[PDB]
């Protein structure tokens, strides 16, 4: 993807006007610097490889992190899967209106000792379970629940000290592309909710300890990383200016277009 | 000459004598749905003379302290003739449009409009916890107006109409990435845009999804000396192109 | 029992690696594709579209539509300055938040030419001529029309065609330049001066406005992707 190179120019005195155009037509001018001045013939070897859509988006970025405690009833985490609880991955995906990509998940699970009271604690290595529940499946309500059998639900097991786990998810959707914006309602009577939450049904993700609470409580924390692969993007869109406030919608507080300087001639 | 056009659609004609060129979509022309991409199994209805014609919306006055206007336009034509009657009896529907904004002034006035047609414009509410209601988002063939000030957060369900943020929380100067034209009263006199069907599904219900939004924002405001005509109106005519419908049922 | 040997760099999580991973849903059937209009293949055609630049930041015009309007009147002297700003498309707050400056803040290096289109949004009976100069660095900012005529300039005559493109060239010692504010890789200044006056007839308003656009040429390039400094977060959005 090499860029175009400038050609040689000559002093002209003619009736052709490359500099004068008409911007009311909605058409940007296609001039190069060899029309308004004299230029030498250079040849560029610069490539546009890093500004591609695949190189811009296919990088891992965190989306959520949740904690859970070992020696505690109802200590387990859940997360409805959405890509708009962070500030930096949400801004990159909202440069386009429609996207279509495959995923690559990665979990980074840590642990920390809690202030117990038993003398000379000693615990073996911990094993975690991360279950994915598609929209409509039965959900667990406690830790030693029957729903962690995973008869059809895909889950992963991981022992502490190894490499982090990693799966891959294809393009799961009802429509032909993921939609980042939706100007409409859910009900046909145009009541109730309005925005992007109508099309978000990716599913839920559950996390727990497998080992029992031996002698000291242990609080773990799992971070979730998204990585889009094989990305196609349609209908570009201006980048977000105001700060994000909520998750379900695009509400904002008004702000100036730039920061101000003291004059129009100041540098 | 390159300043004259004539658009013929059905039993209606639009002529213009000074104008810029026309802007067609993202490079494509509106066409019908092919057999590779269809998902409905029943036969669609293509009337194509009763619905593909020019419908003229209501006029708005360009004052000196004007901020902007916006239409939605699957909803602006919901009461317009036989286009609004096929929208009620059918469940699905796809269409492309051609939009013609027109505003005339003499050689002694000055101003500049930005005629931009954006897809999927989610508008923000004034209160940060709520979403705006239906009557504040779109009126039937009547413009909703921006403001040059900020709507306070005491209002429950009202659209935030700060014009420099364009209601969507983006810079208003960066709205030129969508298909657009300018109406410069020095040279131009009317703007024309041809838009295809842009959606992530091949067909959509036309009553709970507005897949377009036409914004007219005066960047350089209207100004004239004393003596010239103080009343300058703006008129918008929209014509559907290649419309078809599926799923016939009762009236709704 | 093939004898292997694990190298350093094993069992690490590098966030920019291209590896294969086992799929969670085997034999899944995706939804077939559809010809959606407006497919973008590269980010260098988003930066090649014109966008209005807020030249007029005067501490109360940033929260208004007056930031984009450059005031031009009928003067009583010769050679007055219209505007002026240094050419930094990623650090200077004039070109910072445009369509070009919001892509340059995701990358670190940039190289290429920059177009600057001006539109005269005045009356149809007004005339005038302007000088659109660009001075490479090494000296200061030009303070006269005599100092600014010695650089790369173009003389714009208003008329039927209401736009003029000043295309600044790529004059530098290095192949690339830094996006952030640096003194070693400075780029210069862009100014505007009255060539002749703005002459209007009677009953015509003598105060006209000028819009300015900015884009990139066909030899623009960026490198070394980074994170943007314009977004920030304290807690999760919920």
């Amino acid at each position: 993807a090499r860029v175009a190179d400038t050609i040689s120019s000559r002093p002209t005195n003619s009736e052709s006007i490359p500099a004068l155009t008409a911007a009311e037509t909605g058409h940007t001018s296609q001039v190069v610097p060899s029309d308004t001045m004299q230029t030498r013939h250079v040849k560029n070897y610069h490539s546009r490889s890093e500004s591609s859509i695949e190189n811009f988006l296919c990088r891992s970025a965190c989306v959520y992190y949740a904690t859970y405690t070992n020696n505690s009833k109802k200590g387990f985490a859940e997360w409805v899967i959405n890509t708009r609880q962070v500030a930096q991955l949400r801004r990159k995906l909202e440069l386009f209106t429609y996207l279509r990509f495959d995923l690559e998940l990665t979990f980074v699970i840590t642990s920390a000792q809690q202030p117990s009271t038993a003398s000379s604690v000693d615990a073996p290595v911990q094993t975690h379970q991360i279950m994915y529940v598609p929209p409509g499946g039965p959900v667990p309500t406690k830790v030693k629940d029957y729903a962690w059998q995973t008869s059809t639900n895909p889950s992963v097991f991981w022992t502490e000290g190894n490499a982090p786990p990693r799966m891959s998810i294809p393009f799961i959707s009802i429509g032909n592309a993921y939609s980042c914006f939706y100007d409409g309602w859910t009900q046909f009577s145009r009541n109730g909710v309005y925005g992007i939450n109508t099309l978000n049904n990716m599913g839920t993700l559950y996390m727990r300890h497998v080992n029992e609470a031996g002698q000291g409580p242990i609080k773990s924390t799992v971070r979730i990383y998204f990585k889009p692969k094989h990305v196609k993007a349609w209908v570009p869109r201006p980048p977000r200016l105001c700060q994000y406030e909520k998750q379900k919608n695009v509400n904002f507080s008004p702000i100036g277009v730039t920061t101000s300087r003291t004059d129009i001639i100041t540098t | 000459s390159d300043r004259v056009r004539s658009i013929t659609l059905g039993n209606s004609t639009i002529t213009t004598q000074e104008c810029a060129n026309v802007v067609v979509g993202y490079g494509v022309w509106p066409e019908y749905l092919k057999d590779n991409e269809a998902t409905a199994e029943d036969q669609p209805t293509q009337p194509d003379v009763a619905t593909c014609r020019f419908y003229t919306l209501e006029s708005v006055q360009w004052m000196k302290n004007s901020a902007g206007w916006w239409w939605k336009l699957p909803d602006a034509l919901s009461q317009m003739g036989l286009f609004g009657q096929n929208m009620q009896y059918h469940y699905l529907g796809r269409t492309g449009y051609t939009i013609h904004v027109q505003c005339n002034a003499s050689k002694f006035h000055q101003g500049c409009l930005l005629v931009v047609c954006v897809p999927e414009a989610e508008m923000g509410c004034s209160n940060l916890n709520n979403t705006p209601e239906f009557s504040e988002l779109s009126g039937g063939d009547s413009a909703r107006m921006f403001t040059d000030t900020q709507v306070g957060e005491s209002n429950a369900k009202k659209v935030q109409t700060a014009v420099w943020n364009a209601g969507m929380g983006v810079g208003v100067g960066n709205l030129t990435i969508f298909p657009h034209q300018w109406i410069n009263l020095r040279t131009n006199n009317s703007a024309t845009l041809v838009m295809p069907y842009i959606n992530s599904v091949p067909m959509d219900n036309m009553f709970r999804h507005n897949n377009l939004t036409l914004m007219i924002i005066p960047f350089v405001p209207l100004n004239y000396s004393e003596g010239s005509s103080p009343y300058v109106p703006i008129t918008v005519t929209i014509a559907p192109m290649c419309a078809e419908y599926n799923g016939l049922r009762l009236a709704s | 029992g093939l004898p292997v040997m694990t190298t350093p760099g094993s069992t690490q999580f590098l966030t920019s690696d291209d590896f294969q991973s086992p799929s969670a849903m085997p034999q899944f059937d995706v939804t077939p594709e559809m010809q959606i209009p407006g497919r973008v293949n590269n980010l260098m055609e988003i930066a090649e579209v014109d966008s209005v630049v807020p030249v007029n930041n005067t501490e109360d015009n940033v929260s208004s539509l007056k930031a984009y309007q450059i005031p031009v009147q009928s003067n009583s002297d010769n050679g007055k300055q219209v505007f002026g700003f240094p050419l930094q498309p990623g650090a200077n707050n004039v070109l910072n938040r445009t369509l070009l400056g919001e892509i340059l803040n995701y990358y670190t290096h940039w190289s290429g030419s920059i177009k600057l289109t001006f539109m005269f949004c005045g009356s149809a009976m007004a005339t005038g001529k302007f000088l659109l100069a660009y001075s490479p660095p090494g000296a200061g900012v030009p303070k006269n029309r005599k100092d600014a005529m010695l650089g790369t300039h173009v003389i714009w005559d208003v008329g039927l065609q209401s736009s003029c493109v000043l295309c600044v060239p790529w004059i530098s010692q290095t192949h690339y330049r830094y996006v952030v504010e640096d003194e070693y890789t400075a780029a210069g200044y862009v100014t505007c001066w009255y060539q002749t006056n703005i002459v209007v007839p009677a009953d015509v308003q003598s105060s006209c406005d000028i819009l300015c656009f900015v884009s990139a040429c066909n030899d623009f390039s960026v490198r070394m992707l980074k994170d943007t400094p314009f977004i920030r977060q304290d807690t999760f959005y919920q």
Epitope: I255, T259 | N129, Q150 | S63, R232, Q233
Partner: antibody, heavy 117, light 108 residues
Framework: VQLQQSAAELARPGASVKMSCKAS????????MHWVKQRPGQGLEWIGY????????EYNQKFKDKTTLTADKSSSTAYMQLSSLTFEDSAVYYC???????????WGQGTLVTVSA | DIQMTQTKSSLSASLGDRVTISCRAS??????LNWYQQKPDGSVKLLIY???TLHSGVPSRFSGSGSGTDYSLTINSLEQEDIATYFC?????????FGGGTKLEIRR
């Protein structure tokens, strides 16, 4: 990253005071600046906010006719003027920087306002 | 407005005890609650920015619960640096209404 307020004030009944809350460590014209009043016998009480970029202020229904919130861009401070002081205006006033929609993450140390003779 | 009421206003427990502070609303605020902590020298800081989501930089003794109208805040092991005043704040309707104070002390 911190906010610093003024000292403790003292004024006659009917007079006017002007507090301040200098912000540092972040871009001042991005987040809104809120003011919270705490009487010593009650809980916290909201007064209003001000958008420092557009100079738009919005007050509560009780504190509308007394308080006035101003700000400046150069020194990166945010002022607040109380007028027509009565005996129930003797309290502690905090400044807070509003984060995402409904939470305040950074607070001030508060100034003590008293009225007497 | 939404009247955020804490009927406790004073609490007493020994060191190493589990305390519970409850805040009750006027109507359903739909999980939009925040918990703050006011130290006796005047400093206020945010503890839990949801019903149960802990802020960064807060120790893990704190935990929140509740749904609908009734809510709670729990410290499972009371320390010496936790002796402060705790407030609840809703973020559902305009304006923001704070709850009453709740001061903690030692048992005997």
């Amino acid at each position: 990253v911190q906010l610093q307020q003024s000292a403790a004030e003292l004024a006659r009944p009917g007079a006017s005071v002007k507090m301040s809350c200098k912000a540092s460590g972040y871009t001042f014209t991005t987040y809104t600046m809120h003011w919270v009043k705490q009487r010593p016998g009650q809980g916290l009480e909201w007064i209003g906010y001000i958008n420092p970029s557009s100079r738009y202020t919005e007050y509560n229904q009780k504190f509308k006719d007394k308080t006035t919130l101003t700000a400046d861009k150069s020194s990166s401070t945010a002022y607040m003027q109380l007028s027509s002081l009565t005996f129930e205006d003797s309290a502690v006033y905090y400044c807070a920087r509003r984060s995402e929609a409904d939470r305040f993450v950074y607070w001030g140390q508060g100034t003590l306002v008293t009225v007497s003779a | 407005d939404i009247q955020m009421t804490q009927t406790k206003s004073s609490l007493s427990a020994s060191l190493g005890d589990r305390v519970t502070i409850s805040c009750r609303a006027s109507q359903d605020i739909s999980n939009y609650l925040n918990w703050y902590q006011q130290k006796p020298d005047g400093s206020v800081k945010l503890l839990i920015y949801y019903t149960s989501t802990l802020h960064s930089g807060v120790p893990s003794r704190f935990s929140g619960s509740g749904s609908g109208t009734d809510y709670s805040l729990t410290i499972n092991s009371l320390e010496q640096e936790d002796i402060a005043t705790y407030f609840c704040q809703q973020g559902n309707t305009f304006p923001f209404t704070f709850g009453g104070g709740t001061k903690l002390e030692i048992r005997r």
